[PDB]
Swiss-Prot record, chains A, B:
Family: Belongs to the histone-like Alba family.
Reported function: Binds double-stranded DNA tightly but without sequence specificity. Involved in DNA compaction.
Native organism: Pyrococcus horikoshii (strain ATCC 700860 / DSM 12428 / JCM 9974 / NBRC 100139 / OT-3)
Post-translational modification: Acetylated. Acetylation at Lys-7 decreases DNA-binding affinity.
Top-level taxonomy: Archaea, Methanobacteriati, Methanobacteriota, Thermococci, Thermococcales
Protein name as catalogued: DNA/RNA-binding protein Alba
NCBIfam families attached to this UniProt entry: DNA-binding protein Alba, PRK04015.1
Cytoplasm among keywords: yes
Listed GO CC annotations: chromosome; cytoplasm
Cell compartments where the protein resides: Cytoplasm; Chromosome
GO biological process: chromosome condensation
GO molecular function: double-stranded DNA binding; RNA binding
Domain of life, source organism: Archaea
């Protein structure tokens, strides 16, 4: 039950999101990291706003720091975001 | 108590937030819109995960979208985030 923001267009994911919601999913998670986090809030915004206002709330938002491997076997840090949209209760 | 994420280097804003708490700030909000959001999360993470690991955490995170009167009689929407960090008591 999760849609990850990749290279595809923002509207490509609100599609994937609503699709899982259509297919039942009671909570769909919109995950992203790095600069793709802006596109993540984009998706969740267009969904709750433009398409599923009536019956879809933001259940919670949680952030974090993932780890990226560098040429030195050491690791960099990249912010991440998790937006869980749930069916309006 | 607010720090808006502009273009400035990350650290300038993290340091900014910190200074706020350093003065007693019992809660600070890292706001950003558009492509900045991702950088709004960088900040909030670095603060609660590194420079203030022992005395500050995420009290809550908010999202939304806003109108921006632009070219001609047109308004553009942009996503917005308001990460709230509170003092650990
Ligand atoms: N948890 C974090 N995002 N920490 C800071 C890394 C953010 C960004 N990738 C940078 O290095 O500027």
């Amino acid at each position: 039950h999760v849609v990850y923001i990749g290279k595809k267009p923002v509207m490509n994911y609100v599609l994937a999101v609503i699709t899982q919601f259509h297919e039942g999913a009671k909570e769909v998670s919109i995950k992203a990291r790095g600069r793709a986090i802006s596109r993540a809030v984009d998706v969740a915004e267009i969904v709750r706003n433009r398409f599923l206002k009536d019956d879809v709330d933001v259940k919670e938002i949680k952030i974090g720091t993932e780890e990226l491997p560098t040429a030195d076997g050491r690791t960099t840090n990249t912010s991440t975001i998790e937006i869980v949209l749930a069916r309006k209760t």
